């Protein structure tokens, strides 16, 4: 008669690594790394993202006529922009402090567009001939829908002095711009005045822009350039515009109604028609694992990202052959 002490074995083939030995077969183990995703862009917690498609943040905000889809976008969870969107600035130029603006959007979930300077209000200047073939719409020459490219009326561009006061409760994003003409002749041909300026002032801001003449290469068939600027006009503050030519004036401006967590995601993917609680640029995640290896940039309640191919913890013991 005898009694023996012993331990469990089973048909398990699961393996774990240790410092001294690799591929040790154990009776039980626990994977802790999420390796799969669904491969789609999805609603985050019910709230659908802003999918800019072929448009960029600039084309959207300035109102590129190819981006009418996004003329009044509802509240978003995150934003998806391609690496090289084709519909950026249709009329060539620059967007001043573009990155600092984009960064500001990671704190924003919803804009509401409102009119601050009506297009009809320009009685001393021509407001309806400010278009170009570089920004086409339905076969015809058009322009960024949110700003007004003003030119002379009856061969006269008298000084503009307009002032908007933010009576709204919410911070206001205002956009304007300046046009750089090609040569000394085009300046007179559009604005008449040979030397021009644009002065912009708020409580903080103190700006004075001057157009710069230079021989440029054609971009989208245009030698002229547009340089766009921006500010956040606080509540109860007023913006002041004075200019005598080359002024791209505000028509519409966006109210910042909702702030909070958001992000601009870089992805070529399109809407998955789908829901998730954790999203990556490559697809969504649904798992209870503490780690994943899909992609570092995520949004939502996610596991922690690591560059591992494999993380498996032993729970049971060394299994017998």
């Amino acid at each position: 008669d005898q009694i023996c002490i012993g331990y469990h074995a089973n048909n398990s083939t699961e393996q774990v690594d240790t410092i001294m030995e690799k591929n040790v077969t154990v009776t039980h183990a626990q994977d802790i790394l999420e390796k799969t995703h669904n491969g789609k862009l999805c609603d985050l917690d019910g709230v659908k993202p802003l999918i800019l498609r072929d448009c960029s943040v600039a084309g959207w905000l300035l109102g590129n006529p190819m981006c009418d889809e996004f003329i009044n976008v509802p509240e978003w969870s995150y934003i998806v922009e391609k690496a090289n969107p084709v519909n950026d600035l249709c009329y060539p130029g620059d967007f001043n402090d573009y990155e600092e603006l984009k960064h500001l959007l990671s704190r924003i979930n919803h804009f509401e567009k409102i009119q601050i300077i009506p297009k009809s209000s320009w009685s001393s200047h021509e407001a309806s001939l400010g278009v170009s073939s570089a920004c086409p719409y339905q076969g015809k020459s058009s322009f960024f829908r949110n700003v007004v490219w003003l030119i002379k009326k009856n061969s006269t561009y008298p000084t503009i002095k307009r002032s908007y006061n933010n009576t709204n409760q919410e911070d206001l994003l205002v956009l304007w711009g300046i046009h750089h003409p090609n040569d000394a002749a085009e300046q007179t041909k559009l604005y008449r005045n040979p030397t021009t300026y644009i002065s912009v002032g708020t409580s903080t801001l103190n700006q004075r822009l001057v157009p710069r003449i230079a021989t440029r290469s054609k971009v989208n068939g245009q030698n002229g350039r547009m340089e766009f600027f921006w500010t956040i006009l606080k509540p109860n503050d007023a913006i002041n515009f004075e200019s005598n030519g080359n002024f791209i004036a505000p028509e519409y401006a966006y109210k910042i109604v909702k702030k909070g967590d958001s992000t601009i995601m870089k992805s070529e993917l399109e809407y998955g028609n789908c829901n998730t609680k954790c999203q990556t640029p490559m697809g969504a995640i649904n798992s209870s694992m503490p780690f994943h290896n899909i992609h570092p940039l995520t949004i939502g309640e996610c596991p922690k990202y690591v560059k591992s191919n494999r993380l498996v913890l032993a729970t049971g013991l060394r299994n017998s052959p």
Binding site: D1, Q2, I3, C4, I5, G6, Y7, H8, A9, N10, N11, V16, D17, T18, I19, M20, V24, V26, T27, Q30, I32, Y98, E99, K102, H103, S106, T263, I264, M265, K266, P290, F291, P296, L297, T298, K304, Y305, V306, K307, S308, L311, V312, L313, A314, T315, G316, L317, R318, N319, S320, P321
Partner: protein, 162 residues
């Protein structure tokens, strides 16, 4: 392993013990079979469960990357940003992989320890009333029926009685 029991003086585990991690096998005139030791098994389940939750929760607060964009003449800070984001990922990847390696080794040893301790517990009861065979088994000098076997598993094996 460090404690010499698992794949040591006990050469292999038992496919036939399904109700626990560690236990006893008996054989006598009435028959034979396996019986799990519930106390040491449950201690093992608690240790390992706490360990896993400890590992999960320590990696709870950990670096998170954010999207940041830079223009063509901000190449230096763009690169700084990249090296920073990457640097932290490598640090946390290292932490995670090493922790798993180290604690896996400790988990296997823990099981080995529990088996040795159970073996010694029985050895210290039986004392010189049984032959220590050298393979995890004790052969009795007296007939040991199922009641006798149960008392060895009890902690009750009445040594002076035999």
């Amino acid at each position: 392993g460090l404690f010499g029991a698992i794949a040591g003086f006990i050469e292999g585990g038992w496919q036939g013990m399904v109700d626990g991690w560690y236990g006893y096998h008996h054989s006598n005139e009435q028959g034979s079979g396996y019986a799990a030791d519930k106390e040491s098994t449950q201690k093992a389940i608690d240790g390992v469960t706490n360990k896993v939750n400890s590992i999960i929760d320590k990696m709870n607060t950990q670096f998170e990357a954010v999207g940041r964009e830079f223009n063509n003449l901000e190449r230096r800070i763009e690169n700084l940003n990249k090296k920073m984001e990457d640097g932290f990922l490598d640090v946390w990847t290292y932490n995670a992989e090493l922790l798993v390696l180290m604690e896996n080794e400790r988990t296997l040893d823990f099981h080995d320890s529990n088996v040795k301790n159970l073996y010694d517990k029985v050895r210290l009861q039986l004392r010189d009333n049984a032959k220590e065979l050298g393979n995890g088994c004790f052969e009795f000098y007296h007939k040991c029926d199922n009641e006798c076997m149960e008392s060895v598993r009890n902690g009750t094996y009445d040594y002076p009685q035999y």
